[PDB]
Amino acid sequence: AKSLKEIAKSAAAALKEIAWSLKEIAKSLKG
Amino acid sequence: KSLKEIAKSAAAALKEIAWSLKEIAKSLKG
Amino acid sequence: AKSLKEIAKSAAAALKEIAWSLKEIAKSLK
Amino acid sequence: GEIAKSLKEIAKSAAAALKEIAWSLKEIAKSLKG
Amino acid sequence: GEIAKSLKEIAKSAAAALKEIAWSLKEIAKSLKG
Amino acid sequence: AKSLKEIAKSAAAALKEIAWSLKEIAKSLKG
């Protein structure tokens, strides 16, 4: 399946980038 | 039922969420 | 089993609202 | 994959959390508008 | 199966995280109100 | 099926980091 897989892989990856950006926001607001 | 349709819309939203948050992170680095 | 379709639909709907608000937040911060 | 009852109720609580997160983000967007 | 019992643990961790996320966003919305 | 589980695991791990970042952001915004 390109559904249970492939789409879900892109979702998971978007979440990973969400987490990276939120850490960069947290770091800036420590600043 | 399929999830494929739904999971596609979710993934697309999460990519837009990712983009906006990178823009927020960039603005707060300014 | 495939009522998870309907729950996942409501999740995806919330993610779309999240995405929209984040666009407005990014615009305000930019 | 065995939902075995639970995964539907966990997925329900996830969806419920996302609805609350959407509400709070609307409030934050409002606050930041000024 | 292994897997089923995995999604037992995983879906629970996700749900727990989303609850924390919702709560911190409430606190952030409160802080940005003033 | 097994890999849907591994994707869901990656998502869950990212959501945990998102929660941790957000607690640091909430701490920074507290005053």
Author numbering:
A (entry chain D), F (entry chain C): 4 to 34
B (entry chain A): 5 to 34
C (entry chain E): 4 to 33
D (entry chain F), E (entry chain B): 1 to 34
Task: Provide passages from the article that reported this PDB entry.
De novo coiled coils (CCs) are particularly appealing modules for designing self-assembling systems as they are short, mutable, and sequence-to-structure relationships governing their folding and assembly are well established. For example, CC-Tri and CC-Tet exchanged with each other, as did the higher-order CCs, CC-Pent2, CC-Hex2, and CC-Hept. To address this, using the insight from the data and analysis presented here, we have tested two different strategies for increasing specificity of coiled coils: (i) alternate placement of salt bridge-promoting residues, lysine and glutamate to discriminate the tetramer from the trimer; and (ii) incorporation of hendecad repeats to separate the α-helical barrels.
Therefore, we took a different approach of incorporating non-heptad sequence repeats into these peptide sequences. Variations of this 3-4 spacing can lead to alternative CC sequences and structures. Initially, we made several variants of CC-Pent2, CC-Hex2, and CC-Hept that extended the second heptads into hendecad repeats, with the new designs denoted by the suffix “-hen2”. In these, the original a-g sequences were maintained, and the new i-k sites were all made Ala. However, the experiments with CC-Hex2 showed considerable exchange and, therefore, promiscuity between all pairings. However, an X-ray crystal structure of CC-Hex2-hen2 with Ala at h revealed a similar supercoiling to the parent despite the incorporation of the hendecad repeat, possibly explaining the continued promiscuity observed between the CC-Hex2 variants.
